[model samples]
Target chain A: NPEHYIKHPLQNRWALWFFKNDKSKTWQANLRLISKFDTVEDFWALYNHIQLSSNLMPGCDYSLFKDGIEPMWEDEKNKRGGRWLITLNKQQRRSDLDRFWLETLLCLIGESFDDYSDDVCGAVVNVRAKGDKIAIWTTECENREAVTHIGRVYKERLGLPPKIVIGYQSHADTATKSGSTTKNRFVV
Target chain B: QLVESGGGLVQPGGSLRLSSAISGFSISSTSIDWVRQAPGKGLEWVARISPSSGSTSYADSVKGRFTISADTSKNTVYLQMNSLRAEDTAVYYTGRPLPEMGFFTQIPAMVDYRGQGTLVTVSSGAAE
Candidate 1:
């Protein structure tokens, strides 16, 4: 068992990104390409090199996406997809950020979500000074069975409480609202 | 004790702010730089103000009862809001971040912003 061996092979390759807010540059500009990896082992190599999500500055973002697919909402792959939104209440960053992110990675690499794994593209965490967020973007928000199954499984995998509510939103709404945060299209 | 959280003061003590107030954030005259920063940032542009000078302007009706102010002494800005009873609860993001050399594109008058507090007032979105 090499330190970098993967537990499973994901159906897709993924890229990770980092955004830092430089006072002199635009937010988009600060969002540099941290690295990209297809195998679980390579992901760990990159993960160990950067500061944790909890360690990023007030205005920052960490995005993980399938290969050939950009994280932005407008990407054709993303345009039709929807995100299962998990908004951490400023207090859950410690576990929520790292745990959720790692679990998301595991879900992708280990195919933890079962067959619905195909529906799962990647995840993102917006590390704003206001509050941190964890989102699992699925290929289709309209596929109720796959979407709901993925949600329930993801909820269970993340060990979310029965009472904690999470929502789903379309890329269209998110992009139209664009820079401003968009509301949830559906909640579970 | 930084809980790793920052919040906005939509009102001194009012929790009923509208969600749309966040449709576009506020900027007092001094921080009018924020409004100027809108174009490059590609964020929605809605309004700005100078409470001390009574100068104000808006680009949308979704937002109102909002005032933007700046305090040179503290080098801080304030976004005052009232009657956040409903239709005013979008999570507002604000800050003063600098550019990242060749990495960050210069948005005029924009400061690298920090995500301030959330003013989760009742919004039509929630009602729906």
Candidate 2:
């Protein structure tokens, strides 16, 4: 009876993904869908059930995207998109990594960016030996107004200090670069 | 003959205190223990505390970070963990040793009275 209570639904369905690097497997083989949820309660359940981003091994990643949009840049919804990137140093992994990652998820599900929410695609947190990275993927790289607005609201929602700066990079450029090096089309 | 465990959400680098309350019976002479089961994982012993003597022993894996204690007057046992991390997320159960061959054992293998697990979710700091 207690378990049969009504649930609050969200505007869009989302999927959670986990990626573990396995030298013997292909990129797609290494990634798997952990769960999908469309309600607020269901999202909390899934979030509580999975491993924390901070605990993921280096070379691992956790992704949360809209139900129909794949996490990959190759996805049609993401092909022309880009991401607002936040890079964390080794020390910050223990201090700010998890909080930043969670705030990013909240922004996505809560549609914190208002008018630009439609341009939002998904987000990813990468655990790396050198440094950790968190990014919010958007639907278009050339839409400066939408991309910049999303970046501004994101930084504000994350409670990031003004001294810290984050940049938006197109997937096309990132894909062509080695070691994920690419110039920022816009910064906030 | 009632066992209940309680836990809540915690942030990384924060402290988490999990409690298990025993009722319908006296725990004055009993040893209370804690065990945790991660999502999709097997149960692992956490620690044990004897209320009568106030002696405590922890599992090797969680030794330094975990502290187990009990309050005989309240018939409740507690597990306090400091500097919590995401890996600390799990369902924790409070258990009591069972009498075998007319003797009580603290080994988890012999723990018979277990509380319905209490889920502890460790997440990042609040969005607000």
Candidate 3:
């Protein structure tokens, strides 16, 4: 059986999505799924074949989500949840952006959060001109301990300095925000 | 050793060009790459230019819009982008790469120590 297929499987299947913002199209129209993978090898094949987030046009985005979960605030798994949002300045994009994002991706597929592994839904990287945002959206904003645990692990795994703090914001709160700011429910 | 690569802002449809010079090191001695992020967005992997072999790799999406090069004489790594739009606005960076394993290896590589990044902004977007 030399042709037998054997690849390390991830705990959960994941999908990569691309969003190209076109003013003439609807938001939903702009979002498209690039591929889905359940093994370590497949994920690499997909990742290596695509563009890095920075090179994406300003309005583009790359989202990695669990098999069935949509990368949106309204998904059942994400409805009551929030995200560990790391905002990168225009400068850190070069220094920390890709490094940080790669770390986030590993945390998700590697189940790096241990007991809280299932709590994480997926991650999203938004490419914009003003600043770039990478977020790990979770399944429960009310799970205080779990949320913070993920945050602490995520921050440290990214090798972020202790002085740097990342915050968590619930989808519910973000959905209705009047201004640009979305309040943080917890910070780690 | 190297100081932070400084950042600057650029107007829309313009070009972004910057250089990072390493102290006690030659640009041709190792692998260098570029990264970027937009305001309030996640990071993006722009390009990986290995000066050692004078080879370069770019994110498929950014292939044509961006370019990376090095100057051994100046001990510097250079990045450039052209015909920029609002979406092209981002902070661009260059550094030594520490690529990881598995999927992490694609667009992997930790930004080596001693670098922050530079800012490039296309102050405006195409007319809607």
Q: Report the number of the highest-lDDT candidate.
A: 2
Instruction: Give me the candidate number with maximum DockQ.
Output: 1
Per-residue lDDT of model 3, residues B45-125, tens digit only: 677665655667777767788788877777787777777777766777565553311011123224444356667767654
- Model 1 in CAPRI terms: which quality? incorrect
lDDT digits (tens) for residues A3-94 of candidate 1: 45546454677888777644333345457677777666677788888888788777677777777877665566776788887777678876
Error (Å) of candidate 1 at residue A171 is 1.9
lDDT of 2 by residue, A39-134 (tens): 999999888887887888887888889999977765788868889889999999999999999999989999899988999989988888989889
List where candidate 1 sits over 4 angstroms from the true fold: A1-9, A177-181, B1-128
Q: On residues B1-128, what C-alpha lDDT tens digit does candidate 2 reach at each position? A: 53545578888888877777788565656667787778886566688766776767677777789898888888888888887788888888877653211011223444555688788888886653
Q: What is the DockQ of each candidate?
A: 0.05, 0.01, 0.01
lDDT of prediction 3: 0.72
Off by over 4 Å in 3: A1-5, B1-128
Pairs in steric clash, model 2: none
Evaluation by lDDT, superior candidate among 2 and 3: 2
Question: For model 3, what TM-score is found for chain B?
Answer: 0.79
Model 3 / residue A29 / CA error / Å? 1.6
